[PDB]
From a paper:
Cilium assembly and maintenance require multi-subunit intraflagellar transport (IFT) protein complexes: IFT-A and IFT-B, which form repetitive structures known as the IFT trains. Powered by kinesins and dynein 2, IFT trains shuttle cargos along axonemal microtubules to maintain the steady-state ciliary length. IFT-A is also essential for transporting key membrane or membrane-associated proteins, such as GPCRs, ion channels and lipidated proteins, into cilia. For biochemical and structural characterization, we co-expressed and purified the human IFT-A complex, which contains six polypeptides: IFT144 (WDR19), IFT140, IFT139 (TTC21B/THM1), IFT122, IFT121 (WDR35) and IFT43, with IFT144–IFT140–IFT122 and IFT139–IFT121–IFT43 forming the “core” and “peripheral” subcomplexes, respectively.
TULP3 is an adapter protein that mediates the interaction between IFT-A and membrane-embedded or -associated cargos. We determined the cryo-EM structure of IFT-A in complex with TULP3 to gain insights into ciliary transport. We co-purified the IFT-A–TULP3 complex for cryo-EM analysis and found an extra density next to IFT140 and IFT122 which is corresponding to TULP3. To improve the resolution, we determined an overall 4.3-Å structure of the IFT-A (without IFT139)–TULP3 complex. We excluded IFT139 to simplify structural determination, as it is not involved in TULP3 interaction. The final resolution of the TULP3-binding region reaches an overall resolution of ~3.6 Å by focused refinement, allowing confident modeling of the complex. TULP3 interacts with the TPR-like domain of IFT140 and the TPR-like and zinc finger domains of IFT122 via its N-terminal region. We resolved the N-terminal region of TULP3 encompassing residues 19–54 with a helix (residues 19–44) and a loop (residues 45–54); the tubby domain is not resolved due to flexibility. The electrostatic surface representation showed that the helix-docking surface is negatively charged, and the loop-binding interface has mixed chemical properties with both hydrophobic and hydrophilic residues. By stably expressing wild-type (WT) and helical/loop mutants of TULP3 in a Tulp3 KO IMCD3 cell line, we monitored the ciliary levels of ARL13B (a palmitoylated cargo) and GPR161, whose ciliary transportation is dependent on TULP3.18,22,23,54,55 We determined that mutations in the TULP3 helical region (K41A/K42A/R43A), loop region (F47D/V49D) or a combination of both (K41A/K42A/V49D) could significantly disrupt TULP3–IFT-A interaction and reduce ARL13B and GPR161 trafficking to cilia.
Author numbering:
A (entry chain B): 870 to 993
B (entry chain C): 561 to 895
C (entry chain E): 407 to 422, 427 to 438, 447 to 459, 483 to 507, 511 to 518, 521 to 566, 571 to 584, 586 to 589, ...
The structure:
């Protein structure tokens, strides 16, 4: 909470996670992802989702909620892949220049379109 | 026909013939489908021939060599408006709205400072699928329950689905249904009907799309008729409404049939509710129905039976028989 | 002069002498007006009841045409007569009065002699249509108002200063009072600050006294003339009659007698806490206005269960979907606040958000409204999580308003400028 009131929220989430917190860590991490998705930082959105995925699987170490957390793990992993993919497309259609090779954008776009048929995660 | 050359103007094209210049305006993206709309007219000095249009200036050659300029009547907002008056700005606002010139419309509304003028601009901006600029307008109007809604559906990319949403926000539900049934997620039209409380169309749309809503929307429609007053078609729907998983829902439909038919002449066919009642709650609701139709028959019965059992004393004071009242006198909390 | 004005049976007469028959909308010491006969008055008070006169001579009640019936007081001079419905109350300034029934051929005493002083001068007297309710005790008027229940035979006194009802608004004193010409339980009062405010009450035997309406006197109005469905009628300061539709009855002015009766039933069950009776009474009325009205009743009574069916009947599908979504939210005040936002009352929504403690929702609410600055307040002190995000949205808006210096600034504060 010292980092939190000091606005060091990334480190704060890391702290709660390392501190056995499983109510503060998840809530602050979801809030951070929502902030990242709100802006154009889709790559950070993907990385935070990835952290959620592995942390939630760690929480699923508890046999009580194994069934109701493997689902969350799989869902967040898929979201992580999708957003890290979509970051390149977001950059490509905004900057006056281009960074990636055409082959890579082609492959990314095809994978996205064949993994996002009818439901669009926020921002995509 | 000279198309509009100015970069920011989408699709305007004055046609022109002899002593007139019309100001047609294409409309690619609207809720009601695409169409072409006349915006106005003008007049051209005799012996002239248009060559170019740009922001409204119809560079037109004369019958001698010199290119005179004209000003379209339809595009008159270009100049300042301190000279213009409210009675002069209002039609100017309408013209700018037709031309899809939203920036000038915003400027002129800011000058006018009329709430209804801003509201008209907002309705136009919804009508043309301009979600962002409509949000900008509403955020100034102050209307909050629509700012949040529009910010909610700003993500939608599907053309017909977005069309249906922006239709619903313009309180045209029929066209909303029409578009939603063409979008990727038709069940949204269902959701609209079910929220909008028109359960008959809810059944129609659901049956074609979802079968899970069928018994539950049937139950809701039956209850709608029951609170309204009908109790025959309501009972029939209740029969239709019985599911096989939600014992709550199931016995609820059973109680429905019980009460609606009991209101009908069914002391024999609502006589089931003497038995069909699966909860003391059901019994006491039947006690309400058995103070409903001037019962001795089964005011007597359900106040002798139900958790409303002391009530049999009044159910039987209605009658002569004192067995119930006297025997219940120990089993009563109202001396 | 005192300007003696009266209102009865949709007829308003004020000394000038303007008489308005508002049913047909025709405008032409005391004056009394009915539909057919207008009484100008040796009496402290006189009245026509069809062809009858209520002459109060010495300690007696007399009748003559245009000597028919006689009534005997044993009790001082009455100087108060009031005919409403088919009942008359004849009141004195000596804490004495009676109620005489009129449904028969002649005046007959429905209630016996009484003394207010035993139960509690009298300022003014009025009656209900049913006549079971008969008052301002006193020569200046007093804050307390007394009501004598004929049937159960006691008295009820309501104190303006204390807001308390004794069975046998704190700086206002009742000065004038009238009754509705259709509902015996509907009572109204004009109270002047010791400025002038009009208080309408519903007298429920099973519940007591209820606060129905409380609105300040109109600027064009100076005295409370009375009411008749669906308008509060006042004397206009120099048509000299001002009719104000009742707050619940806004929009049902041209509805039928039975439609207005249903609206009255809803209004009564609103005066009581029976939302259920109110709604079940209003089940065959297709005007969006009524549903909107009880759909702010729901707001004022944190009862969303019946709300959902309502804003269906009103065509406000947007709001219904909003409620459906907000149902996810884990709070009770929160859903009510969302509902209120959907139905034209931002301020109450702000209040319930404040009390709910769901400050992040308050933040979004201010952002939705043009409260772009209050938003930064709630972000600065309460969320500290959307502060980056609140700053960002503000920067975006600033870019939207074509001001790209403050926009740069908030880009840099949000750390997104990069």
């Amino acid at each position: 909470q010292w980092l939190a009131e000091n606005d060091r929220f990334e480190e704060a989430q890391k702290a709660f996670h390392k501190a056995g917190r499983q109510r503060e860590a998840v809530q602050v991490l979801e809030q951070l992802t929502n902030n990242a998705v709100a802006e154009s930082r889709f790559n950070d959105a993907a990385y935070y989702y990835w952290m959620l995925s592995m942390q939630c699987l760690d929480i699923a170490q508890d046999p009580a909620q194994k069934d109701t957390m493997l689902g969350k793990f799989y869902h967040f992993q898929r979201l992580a892949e999708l957003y890290h993919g979509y970051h390149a497309i977001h950059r490509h259609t905004e900057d006056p220049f281009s960074v990636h090779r055409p082959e890579t954008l082609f492959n990314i776009s095809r994978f996205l379109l064949h993994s996002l048929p009818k439901d669009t995660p926020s921002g995509i | 026909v000279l198309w509009e050359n100015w970069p920011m103007d989408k699709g305007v094209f004055i046609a022109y013939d002899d002593d007139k210049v019309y100001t047609y305006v294409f409309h690619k993206d609207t809720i009601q489908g695409a169409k072409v709309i006349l915006a106005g007219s003008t007049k051209v000095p005799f012996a002239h021939k248009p060559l170019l249009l740009y922001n409204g200036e119809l560079t037109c050659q004369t019958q001698s060599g010199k290119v005179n300029n004209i000003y379209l009547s339809t595009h008159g907002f270009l100049s300042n408006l301190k000279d213009t008056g409210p009675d002069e700005l209002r039609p100017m606002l309408a013209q700018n709205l037709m031309l899809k010139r939203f920036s000038d419309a915003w400027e002129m509304c800011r000058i006018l400072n009329d709430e209804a003028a801003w509201n008209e601009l907002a309705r136009a901006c919804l009508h043309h699928m301009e979600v962002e600029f409509a949000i900008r307008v509403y955020r100034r109007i102050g209307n909050v329950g629509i700012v949040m809604s529009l910010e909610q559906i700003k993500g939608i990319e599907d053309y017909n689905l977005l069309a249906g949403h922006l239709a619903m926000f313009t309180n045209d539900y029929n066209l909303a249904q029409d578009l939603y049934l063409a979008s990727s997620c038709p069940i949204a039209a269902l959701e609209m009907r079910r929220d909008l409380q028109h359960w008959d169309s809810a059944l129609q749309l659901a049956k074609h799309l979802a079968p899970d809503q069928i018994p539950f929307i049937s139950k809701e429609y039956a209850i709608q008729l029951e609170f309204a007053g009908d109790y025959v078609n309501a009972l029939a729907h209740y029969e239709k409404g019985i599911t096989g998983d939600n014992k709550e829902h199931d016995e609820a439909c059973l109680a429905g049939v019980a009460q609606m038919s009991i209101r009908m002449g069914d002391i024999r066919r609502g006589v089931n509710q003497a038995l069909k009642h699966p909860s003391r709650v059901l019994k006491r609701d039947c006690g309400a129905i058995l103070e409903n139709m001037k019962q001795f028959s089964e005011a007597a019965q359900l106040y002798e039976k139900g958790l409303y059992y002391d009530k049999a004393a009044s159910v039987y004071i209605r009658s002569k028989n004192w067995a119930k009242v006297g025997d219940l006198l120990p089993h009563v909390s109202s001396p | 002069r005192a300007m003696s004005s009266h209102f009865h049976q949709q007829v308003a007469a004020m000394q000038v002498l303007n008489v308005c028959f508002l049913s047909t909308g025709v405008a032409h010491s005391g004056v009394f007006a009915t539909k057919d006969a207008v009484a100008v008055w040796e009496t402290p008070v006189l009245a026509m009841h069809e062809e009858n006169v209520y002459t109060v001579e010495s300690n007696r009640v007399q009748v003559r045409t245009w000597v028919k019936q006689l009534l005997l007081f044993s009790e001082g001079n009455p100087c108060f007569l009031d005919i409403c419905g088919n009942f008359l109350v004849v009141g004195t300034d000596l804490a004495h009065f009676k109620s005489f029934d009129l449904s028969r051929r002649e005046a007959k005493a429905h209630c016996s002699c009484r003394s207010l002083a035993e139960l509690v001068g009298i300022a003014s007297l009025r009656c209900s249509s049913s006549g079971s309710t008969i008052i301002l005790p006193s020569n200046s008027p007093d804050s307390k108002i007394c009501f004598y229940d004929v049937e159960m035979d006691t008295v009820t006194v309501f104190d303006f200063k204390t807001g308390q009802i004794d069975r046998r608004l704190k700086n206002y004193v009742p000065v004038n009072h009238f009754w509705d010409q259709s509902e015996p339980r509907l009572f109204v009062c004009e109270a002047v600050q010791e400025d002038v405010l009009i208080l309408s009450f519903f007298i429920s035997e099973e519940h007591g006294f209820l606060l129905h309406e409380s609105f300040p006197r109109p600027a064009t109005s100076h005295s409370l003339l009375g009411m008749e469905v669906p308008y509060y009628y006042f004397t206009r300061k120099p048509q000299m009659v001002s009719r104000r539709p009742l707050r619940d009855f806004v929009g049902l002015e041209d509805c039928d007698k039975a439609t207005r009766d249903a609206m009255l039933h809803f209004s009564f069950f609103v005066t009581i806490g029976d939302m259920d009776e109110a709604f079940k009474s209003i089940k065959l009325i297709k005007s969006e206005a009524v549903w909107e009205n009880m759909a702010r009743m729901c707001v004022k009574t944190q009862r969303l269960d019946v709300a959902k069916v309502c804003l269906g009947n009103m065509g406000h599908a947007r709001g219904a979907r909003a409620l459906r979504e907000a149902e996810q939210e884990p709070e009770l005040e929160a859903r009510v606040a969302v509902l209120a936002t959907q139905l034209g009352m931002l301020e109450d929504a702000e209040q319930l958000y404040r009390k709910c403690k769901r400050h992040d929702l308050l933040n979004k609410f201010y952002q939705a409204a043009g409260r772009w600055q209050e938003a930064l307040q709630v972000a600065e002190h309460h969320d500290r999580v959307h502060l980056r995000s609140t700053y960002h949205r503000y920067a975006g808006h600033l870019e939207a308003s074509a001001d790209c210096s403050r926009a740069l600034s908030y880009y840099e504060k949000s750390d997104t400028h990069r």
